[PDB]
Amino acid sequence: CKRPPGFSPLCTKSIPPI
C-alpha cells in the first residue's frame, strides 16, 4: 500500500500486501 506518486495510490499484491 501507498506509493511515491500522490496521484495513483492503490494496494496491489495480496501475498504479501502492499
Side-chain angles (χ1 to χ4, degrees):
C1 284
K2 296 184 180 180
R3 283 183 176 193
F7 291 90
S8 188
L10 288 92
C11 298
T12 173
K13 290 180 180 180
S14 300
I15 183 84
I18 298 303

Short mmCIF file of all heavy atoms in Angstrom, two decimals:
data_model
loop_
_atom_site.label_atom_id
_atom_site.label_comp_id
_atom_site.label_asym_id
_atom_site.label_seq_id
_atom_site.Cartn_x
_atom_site.Cartn_y
_atom_site.Cartn_z
N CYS A 1 0.83 -1.21 0.00
CA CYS A 1 0.00 0.00 0.00
C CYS A 1 0.86 1.26 0.00
O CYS A 1 1.99 1.25 0.51
CB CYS A 1 -0.93 0.02 1.22
SG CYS A 1 -2.37 -1.08 1.08
N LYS A 2 0.31 2.34 -0.58
CA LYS A 2 0.98 3.66 -0.68
C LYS A 2 2.23 3.59 -1.55
O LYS A 2 3.11 2.75 -1.34
CB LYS A 2 1.33 4.23 0.71
CG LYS A 2 0.12 4.55 1.57
CD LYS A 2 0.52 5.19 2.89
CE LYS A 2 -0.69 5.51 3.75
NZ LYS A 2 -0.31 6.14 5.04
N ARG A 3 2.30 4.50 -2.53
CA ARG A 3 3.44 4.57 -3.46
C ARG A 3 3.97 6.01 -3.55
O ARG A 3 3.21 6.95 -3.27
CB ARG A 3 3.02 4.08 -4.85
CG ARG A 3 2.91 2.56 -4.96
CD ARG A 3 2.57 2.13 -6.37
NE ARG A 3 2.56 0.67 -6.51
CZ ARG A 3 2.52 0.01 -7.68
NH1 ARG A 3 2.50 0.67 -8.84
NH2 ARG A 3 2.52 -1.31 -7.69
N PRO A 4 5.27 6.22 -3.94
CA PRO A 4 5.90 7.56 -4.06
C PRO A 4 5.00 8.66 -4.71
O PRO A 4 4.94 9.76 -4.16
CB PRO A 4 7.16 7.32 -4.91
CG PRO A 4 7.28 5.83 -5.11
CD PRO A 4 6.27 5.16 -4.22
N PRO A 5 4.30 8.40 -5.88
CA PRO A 5 3.44 9.43 -6.51
C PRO A 5 2.09 9.58 -5.81
O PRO A 5 1.46 8.58 -5.44
CB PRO A 5 3.24 8.90 -7.95
CG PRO A 5 4.10 7.69 -8.08
CD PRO A 5 4.29 7.17 -6.68
N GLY A 6 1.67 10.83 -5.63
CA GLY A 6 0.40 11.12 -4.97
C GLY A 6 -0.73 11.39 -5.94
O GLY A 6 -1.47 12.37 -5.78
N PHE A 7 -0.86 10.53 -6.96
CA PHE A 7 -1.90 10.67 -7.98
C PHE A 7 -2.55 9.32 -8.31
O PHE A 7 -3.68 9.27 -8.79
CB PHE A 7 -1.32 11.29 -9.26
CG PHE A 7 -0.92 12.73 -9.12
CD1 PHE A 7 0.36 13.07 -8.72
CD2 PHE A 7 -1.83 13.75 -9.38
CE1 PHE A 7 0.74 14.39 -8.58
CE2 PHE A 7 -1.46 15.07 -9.24
CZ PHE A 7 -0.18 15.40 -8.84
N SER A 8 -1.81 8.24 -8.05
CA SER A 8 -2.28 6.88 -8.31
C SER A 8 -2.04 5.94 -7.09
O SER A 8 -1.55 4.82 -7.28
CB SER A 8 -1.57 6.33 -9.56
OG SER A 8 -2.13 5.09 -9.97
N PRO A 9 -2.38 6.34 -5.81
CA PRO A 9 -2.15 5.48 -4.63
C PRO A 9 -3.18 4.34 -4.52
O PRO A 9 -4.38 4.58 -4.31
CB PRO A 9 -2.27 6.44 -3.43
CG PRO A 9 -2.37 7.81 -4.01
CD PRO A 9 -2.96 7.64 -5.37
N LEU A 10 -2.69 3.11 -4.68
CA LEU A 10 -3.53 1.90 -4.61
C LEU A 10 -2.80 0.80 -3.83
O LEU A 10 -1.68 1.00 -3.36
CB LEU A 10 -3.90 1.41 -6.02
CG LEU A 10 -4.91 2.28 -6.77
CD1 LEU A 10 -4.21 3.33 -7.62
CD2 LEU A 10 -5.82 1.41 -7.63
N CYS A 11 -3.44 -0.38 -3.70
CA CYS A 11 -2.85 -1.51 -2.99
C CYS A 11 -2.92 -2.78 -3.83
O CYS A 11 -3.99 -3.35 -4.04
CB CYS A 11 -3.55 -1.73 -1.64
SG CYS A 11 -3.41 -0.32 -0.49
N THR A 12 -1.75 -3.20 -4.33
CA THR A 12 -1.62 -4.40 -5.15
C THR A 12 -0.82 -5.48 -4.41
O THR A 12 -0.25 -5.22 -3.35
CB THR A 12 -1.00 -4.10 -6.56
OG1 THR A 12 -0.73 -5.31 -7.28
CG2 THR A 12 0.29 -3.27 -6.47
N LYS A 13 -0.79 -6.69 -5.01
CA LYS A 13 -0.09 -7.85 -4.43
C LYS A 13 -0.72 -8.24 -3.09
O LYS A 13 -0.45 -7.62 -2.06
CB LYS A 13 1.43 -7.61 -4.29
CG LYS A 13 2.17 -7.56 -5.62
CD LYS A 13 3.66 -7.32 -5.41
CE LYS A 13 4.40 -7.27 -6.73
NZ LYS A 13 5.86 -7.03 -6.54
N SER A 14 -1.59 -9.24 -3.14
CA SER A 14 -2.29 -9.74 -1.95
C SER A 14 -1.42 -10.68 -1.10
O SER A 14 -1.77 -10.97 0.05
CB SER A 14 -3.57 -10.47 -2.36
OG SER A 14 -4.45 -9.60 -3.06
N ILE A 15 -0.29 -11.15 -1.66
CA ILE A 15 0.61 -12.06 -0.94
C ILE A 15 2.11 -11.78 -1.28
O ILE A 15 2.63 -12.31 -2.27
CB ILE A 15 0.22 -13.57 -1.20
CG1 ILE A 15 1.11 -14.54 -0.39
CG2 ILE A 15 0.24 -13.95 -2.68
CD1 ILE A 15 0.64 -14.77 1.03
N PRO A 16 2.82 -10.92 -0.48
CA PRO A 16 2.28 -10.19 0.69
C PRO A 16 1.52 -8.90 0.27
O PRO A 16 1.53 -8.60 -0.93
CB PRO A 16 3.54 -9.84 1.51
CG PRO A 16 4.71 -10.41 0.76
CD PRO A 16 4.25 -10.60 -0.65
N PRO A 17 0.88 -8.11 1.19
CA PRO A 17 0.15 -6.89 0.80
C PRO A 17 1.04 -5.65 0.68
O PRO A 17 2.03 -5.52 1.41
CB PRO A 17 -0.88 -6.69 1.93
CG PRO A 17 -0.64 -7.82 2.91
CD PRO A 17 0.76 -8.29 2.66
N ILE A 18 0.68 -4.76 -0.25
CA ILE A 18 1.42 -3.52 -0.48
C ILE A 18 0.43 -2.35 -0.57
O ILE A 18 -0.65 -2.49 -1.15
CB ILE A 18 2.32 -3.60 -1.76
CG1 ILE A 18 3.39 -4.71 -1.63
CG2 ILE A 18 2.98 -2.25 -2.10
CD1 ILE A 18 4.33 -4.60 -0.43
#
